[PDB]
Design a binder for these strands. Structure first.
Lengths: 46, 100
RNA sequence: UUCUGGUGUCCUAGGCGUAGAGGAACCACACCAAUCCAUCCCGAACUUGGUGGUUAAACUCUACUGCGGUGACGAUACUGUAGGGGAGGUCCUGCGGAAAAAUAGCUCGACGCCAGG
RNA sequence: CAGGUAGACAGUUUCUAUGGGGCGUAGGCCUCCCAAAAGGUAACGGAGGCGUGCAAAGGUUUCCUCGGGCCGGACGGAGAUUGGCCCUCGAGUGCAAAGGCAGAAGGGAGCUUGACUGCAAGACCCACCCGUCGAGCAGGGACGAAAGUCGGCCUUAGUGAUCCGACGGUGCCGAGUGGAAGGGCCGUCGCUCAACGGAUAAAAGUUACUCUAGGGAUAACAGGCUGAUCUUCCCCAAGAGUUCACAUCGACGGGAAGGUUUGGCACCUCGAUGUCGGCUCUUCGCCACCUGGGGCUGUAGUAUGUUCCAAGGGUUGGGCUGUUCGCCCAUUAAAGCGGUACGUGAGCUGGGUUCAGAACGUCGUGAGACAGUUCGGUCCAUAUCCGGUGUGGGCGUUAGAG
RNA sequence: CUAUAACGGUCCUAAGGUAGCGAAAUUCCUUGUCGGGUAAGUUCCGACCCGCACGAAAGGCGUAACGAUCUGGGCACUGUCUCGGAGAGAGGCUCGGUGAAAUAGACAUGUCUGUGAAGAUGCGGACUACCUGCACCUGGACAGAAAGACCCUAUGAAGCU
RNA sequence: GACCAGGCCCGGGCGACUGUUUACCAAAAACACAGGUCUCCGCAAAGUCGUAAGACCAUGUAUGGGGGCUGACGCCUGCC
RNA sequence: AACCCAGAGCUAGCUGGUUCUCCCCGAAAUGCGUUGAGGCGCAGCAGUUGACUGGACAUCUAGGGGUAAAGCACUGUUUCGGUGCGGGCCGCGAGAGCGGUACCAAAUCGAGGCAAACUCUGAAUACUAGAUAUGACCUCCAAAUAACAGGGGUCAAGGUCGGCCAGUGAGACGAUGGGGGAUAAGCUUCAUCGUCGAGAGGGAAACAGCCCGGAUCACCAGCUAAGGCCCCUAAAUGACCGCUCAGUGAUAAAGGAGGUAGGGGUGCAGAGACAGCCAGGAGGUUUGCCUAGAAGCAGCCACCCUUGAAAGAGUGCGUAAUAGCUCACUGAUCGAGCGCUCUUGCGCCGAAGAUGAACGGGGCUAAGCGGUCUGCCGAAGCUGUGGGAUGUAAAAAAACAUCGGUAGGGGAGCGUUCCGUGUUAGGGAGAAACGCGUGCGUGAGCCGCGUUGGACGAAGCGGAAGCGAGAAUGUCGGCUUG
RNA sequence: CUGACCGCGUGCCUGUUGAAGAAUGAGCCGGCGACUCAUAGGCAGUGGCUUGGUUAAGGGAACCCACCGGAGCCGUAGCGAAAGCGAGUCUUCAUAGGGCAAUUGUCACUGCUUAUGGACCCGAACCUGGGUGAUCUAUCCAUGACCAGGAUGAAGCUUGG
RNA sequence: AGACAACCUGGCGAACUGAAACAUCUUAGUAGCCAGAGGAAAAGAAAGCAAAAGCGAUUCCCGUAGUAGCGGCGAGCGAA
């Protein structure tokens, strides 16, 4: 004994998924080419 | 058995910091003994309180290397204004009232 | 227009120690008596009245850093936020603030004001 | 009608906090710390004080300022009156502490009563009730030549609402009118109302004969967290062991795991989780008592002593006590420690404890009481479901059966 | 001899326990020492005495007889036990007839571990298990029963002093 | 000789005995009792009940009545 | 301290119960006082309404404080050495003297710390007070082409007083600074923030209080955050650099270590090394003492010199002790890489419990951990498209801005029995209970539609309520389970 | 309509810091069952009137009631304990200085909320008054009845003294 | 001489409660019980109220007034 144990909430901070590798923390999503705009989608003109 | 636990809870701050606006008669310092001495335009009190005599500003400064020497001044300036927002709010009160 | 003491105010504060310089004017002591006065005892102080001898003391002025005061930058502690490590006591990075201490240093203050010779 | 007078009888009270209640302490104000560089701040958190004193320790106008070292002079002594040098306000300031104050708020003198009446802009605090300061004006003064200061005391404790009564003074009402009784009003005084925002002017216990409304908001049994304690370990080793630290014991101190003792919290459970010990029946853990194998031994052998792998098994019968190493007897290979809601009461007994009777010692004047003793004291049940032991049937097994 | 004090001094009250009895229905420590009894006896009998806190009509001490009294040891007798066994009866069991009960949110109602108001069939992972009867046992469903009787609270009720 | 029909001793504690008691968890060492002492009461008593009349007491009368404690019997019953 | 009836529906600051729809806003669990603390009064924080307002957010500058850290000036303690005052002791002698002691102690000095009730100093934040800007969109007019300034219209937003009215008054954990405890608790107590409370969803296996994030609705559309990409479950068993061989990867220390990849220092390596085979390995001397004996090796003293390549008054065993044995040291061959040293990273042992592997499982040598670059999955978040609702606001819109929510407040509604309009419209070709219509509504509910029976009764505008039920161990009746 | 198989999903209310909870409650179904009324104060919405608003008791060919009924209330003057004075008044030597004043509606209907009433519904143990109870039981009184069968053997009385 | 729903007069007369306890007070002179009588009873013709002005037997409703006042000046009661 002489060592406490880690309970609810307390247990969570020790043992939740952390992304502890500086690299993957850094990253950002792909961007893209700007994708020039798109036409209308509907027309009464018929 | 405890014997202990008899605290008073009294409060004694500085009331008007340097470069605030002192009314006349208003208290500058409520103190226990004389940390800050009276300078000019202030009056000591019965219990060493330091209160303003004329409107103006409070200036804490050394009256000796050690002492505070609190003081007051007329400090009247700036009549000039530059804020659009206050005028805007007032303008809205009326426009909306008229609309409704 | 320096100098002489007269009063004062921003202040790093300002001084003690060693050195010097000051008597024509100013300042101050030695000197002298006593109404007003005064010493709980004493003219010691305080007082009025005289002689008006030195600059010795005190004050003033110029140096000094031996003390006293002052005091950095940098760095580091610490801390705001955002996070993390450690079973804990507690530790560590990112952006922001940032010292006490010590040491080098920095001062022997700056201005006014009136009567003067 | 009046005084006294049996709880014989009645009507009622007996506070709260309280890291369960009771016992103990505490209950208001002041100062310092916790208070986290404005204010504020909580704890049965750590230190102390107060319920006053002063006709001056108040007010003014003045003057000087303490101490603690050293040197001088008889006793005089470590320390008492008298002169010379450092000094940071280390002295004191009536009483506690903090802040303050050395042109002093320190000490001493001179005269005096402003520790006056009517007040007051504005502030500070701020649930309210309270509380604190106050420029300035009028009257009438003190001191001071004058300027000026003076409506208590260096500041913060020295104090308590309202109702009621009491006393002094009133160019106010006075129930038809004049009076008066009485009251009003102004100044005041009267409660360790101390449980100090004070239920009344006036109030203690006990209930095991109890009872109701509630609570797992707060206990006891058990579970959980925590290991202070307790069990078992490992480190260093001073030594002891004839010499030799480690065959064996290991002082002084340190680092762990366990969860079962005693505990700490009090999280579930008070529309209820039935306690100690025995009986019967389990089953599991090991750090191992005995049996299986091994090192090392200060092992000649026979005994051992210790550690290592080892839970497959085993782990008596009694006497005493209600009481698991608490124990003597006789053996025995040995006659283990534990977990399982201190396993097991919808399986059993009720010897103990927590019911009503009674008594002893003691406490209480008393009712009653003692985690003291002593004798007596109906522990209820025809399994729905999961579980388990047995045994069947349908159906699957692809044609159907032995 | 050493000890224990026959006997003395001090404050004290109104005085300071007499006779008997005593670890006692009173002694806590405490299975107190010692003796007897027993193979072994914290119970028991007889004594000692530092009576925590016995004691003289809330009586002291002792007593022949009596006790559905409490307590210790005996002889005889036995299933109380060692260590069970067989048997008869009534139930249980099956068939014919009549036919309740308390309980009950709905239950299509597994084990181990983990979690979670910190002791779950209802959640997670893994294992295990054809559907459904009947007899039998009672470890769970914090099973039923009585809004706990222990503990606390209520400016609750009631009894006694 | 079936049915029916005392187990008995030795030693303690408490209570003298027979008896009564918690209808439905206590049959006892508890209560009572024979006995003891205290104290009150002179007869239109004391005590109890009833506001009052009055009634028990007692159609008794001081060896008799009410009340308190202890509980045969033996020796006793201290001091303040 | 009966039982029945009455006051009596006693009282209960205590338990339980409190029924139909939608919409908007939406807390607290703190202080104070309380015969008071599982109540109540006031404040503090909701609603709604009326004024006066000015902000809020960011930025910057001032002002006071004594906390964190530091410091020994102060106070209180604190070690090491200096100094010696003075005292005790030996005595000489009948007075105090020079001194001596490995002597006890007061001030001081040098070095050196420590403190909630210590400070000569002293931050960051916090606080108070000032000025300084500009938020989101539009429609624009004039642009080559933007931008922005030029206006106009919106929308969004702070407070300080009040009115009418609430609920709340023991919070929990996490982070930090602390008290109490044992720097133990999912403990307790306060200060500043977050989430839960009152809040869903994804990650965390399950799992209020940790991470991202905030739920008006529809969508068999897309991009991402926290977290992840072998199978169970979506997505690379994808790239390259390293490191681990224990199933570590999921849990704990002191201590131990030639485990392992590196690093920091150190000397040696043809006047050749650590390996081994080797050789040699002393004279004085039995070192002095003690001891029976001590002779290197019980113990202690001197602890050197000579000789030489090299030998320490001998390293260990041993002998009664000697002797004996062997080390250190030293030359030759073989041959040129080996000692020492502290720490980094990942590991091993130390590290053991009671029903059965408990750590998601299958498993894995990468599908583990350290590092970087690329693609993807991933929520109710953001986008896209389309409805609804609140105000802003006063009117068609349209445009914004919002729309989680318990206690609680405000707005708008449905429904039921009865009444006014009535001896209504309608109705024996047929009033209500049951059902087909996802007809219709945001919903409570409404229209229609049918039957053996079969008598009454809508709609609209209004009114009243014995007015809306699964929770009271409610209650009356009928029925089951066993 | 039924559902092979996959995924997600730890009953509902009360109540808690916190429940799927192994905390509460309910067997199921259908009904009965809880902030109501009276009068009054305050506030809001709506309406009538206004250089005022309103009537109450009471009459009215019933009861409702058109009309009547002005007594009464509210809004018009404050300050003061009071006499009193009055746009001021109290406090005072005084303006001084200050405090409070220097103006306002009303009636009704509908909600909210407060107050007294059983006042949202259910639930106490209890208290007090009046009455009924001794067929159970507890003593007593009157009057009856009962106690098988055996054993022991006192005092008295009588004998050898 | 008995009977009575309620109303009335008289005698006796509580308590739970409110005061956040409780003894003054309040529920309240209520409830209840007893005793009479009536369709109504009780009260009633002034030794009254008033206030320098007037009234004129009783009994009820409105209103003065939840005012004056009383009150551990508390809860509350409350006229004329």
């Amino acid at each position: 004994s002489s060592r406490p144990q880690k309970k609810g909430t307390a247990h969570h901070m020790k043992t939740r998924p952390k992304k502890t590798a500086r690299w993957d923390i850094k990253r950002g999503p792909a961007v893209y080419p700007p994708l020039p705009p798109l036409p209308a989608e509907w027309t009464i003109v018929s | 058995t405890k014997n202990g636990r008899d605290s008073k809870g009294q409060r004694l701050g500085v009331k008007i910091y340097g470069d605030q606006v002192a009314k006349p008669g208003a208290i500058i310092i409520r103190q226990r003994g004389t940390k800050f001495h009276p300078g000019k335009n202030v009056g000591i009190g019965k219990d060493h309180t330091i209160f303003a005599l004329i409107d103006g500003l409070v200036k804490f400064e050394k009256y000796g290397p050690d002492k505070k020497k609190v003081s007051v001044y007329p400090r009247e300036i700036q009549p000039e204004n530059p804020n659009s927002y206050r005028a805007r709010k007032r303008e809205n009160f009326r426009l909306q009232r008229e609309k409704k």
